[PDB]
Each structure stands twice: as structure tokens, then as C-alpha cells.
Ligand binder design. Structure first.
Ligand SMILES: NC(=O)c1ccccc1O
Length: 167
């Protein structure tokens, strides 16, 4: 049993809810919250900007030190950093950004990072301002992630379309 509440069960391991991931993280304090990161860990907008704002910019300060030491992530890659006030850990995962022309086949590689963690609170990778089709992102998630994933979908209209169209 875990603390996640109000989710619709899509599969054995994937759950979904219309929720603000920031508000969900603050309530649950999950072991892992996933950030929709870019390779520079520049948390300007979308999910990343919202998570970073909720940490009072501490996520960005930590991320800048990580990049200064290690250099940029790979598209499809990840790193584990602090979850600050939101979670124990933040798994920063880089899905491909269609608005930068990145290979959508890298979305499966991005979701494979989730398999290193038994339970996660996450957004749909490459959705929102990353430009991918969220229906596609949910299909790749279900077909790639084997660990238990709780997906937060900010937009109620999109949530209802994801559920209604789910195969
Ligand atoms: N998932 C989001 O994009 C988000 C979440 C909280 C506040 C602003 C936001 O844009």
C-alpha cells in the first residue's frame, strides 16, 4: 500500500490523475518526483519551472552546481538530485523536445530511466511545451515502465482525452 489517492488505474503498474504535480508532491512527499528536464537543467517553464519555483529556486542552484561538475545530460538520460521540499529525490529526465527537432524514438529511452525506481510521481515525458503528442507519451510510458508510476496530468481537458482514448 502507498499514499497516492484518487488515481485511475490504467494497467498493473501505471496510474493517472488530473493534478498539479507540484501540489501532489507537496501532499504525498514521494520518494521520487520526476522533472521534465532539459540537458542543461535550466528549469525555466513547464513542469520544470513550476517544480523549481516551488523549491524557491533551490532546485536551480543545485542543478547549476551539477552541470558545472558533470556537463549536460543526454537527451533520453537522467540524473538523481535532491527533491528539496517536494520529495526525497528528484529524477531529472530529459525527453526529446519536438520544438528543438529531437528524435521521438528517444522517448522510450527517457522512460527507461523510471525502471531504476520502484515508485515514482511523474509527468508525461515530452508533453506540454516539449511538443510531443501526450497520447503517444502515455502509450510509450505503459509499454516501457515496469515500476509503479503515478502520472499527474495538469490539464483536465487532456486528462479526460487520455483516459477516454486509452487502449
Ligand atoms: N505542469 C505544469 O506545467 C505546471 C504546474 C504547476 C504550475 C504551473 C505549471 O505550468
Amino acid at each position: 500500500v502507498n499514499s497516492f489517492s484518487g488515481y485511475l488505474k490504467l494497467t498493473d503498474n501505471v496510474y493517472i490523475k488530473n493534478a498539479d504535480i507540484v501540489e501532489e508532491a507537496k501532499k504525498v512527499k514521494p520518494t521520487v518526483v520526476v522533472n521534465a528536464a532539459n540537458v542543461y537543467l535550466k528549469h525555466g517553464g513547464g513542469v520544470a519551472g513550476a517544480l523549481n519555483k516551488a523549491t524557491n529556486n533551490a532546485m536551480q542552484v543545485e542543478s547549476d552546481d551539477y552541470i558545472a561538475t558533470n556537463g549536460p545530460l543526454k537527451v533520453g538520460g537522467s540524473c538523481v538530485l535532491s527533491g528539496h521540499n517536494l520529495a526525497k529525490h528528484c529524477l531529472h529526465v530529459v525527453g526529446p523536445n519536438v520544438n528543438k527537432g529531437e528524435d521521438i524514438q528517444l522517448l522510450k529511452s527517457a522512460y527507461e530511466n523510471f525502471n531504476q525506481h520502484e515508485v515514482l510521481l511523474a509527468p508525461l515525458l515530452s508533453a506540454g511545451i516539449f511538443g510531443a503528442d501526450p497520447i503517444h507519451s502515455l502509450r510509450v510510458c505503459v509499454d516501457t515502465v515496469r515500476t509503479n508510476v503515478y502520472l499527474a496530468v495538469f490539464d483536465k481537458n487532456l486528462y479526460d482525452k487520455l483516459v477516454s482514448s486509452f487502449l
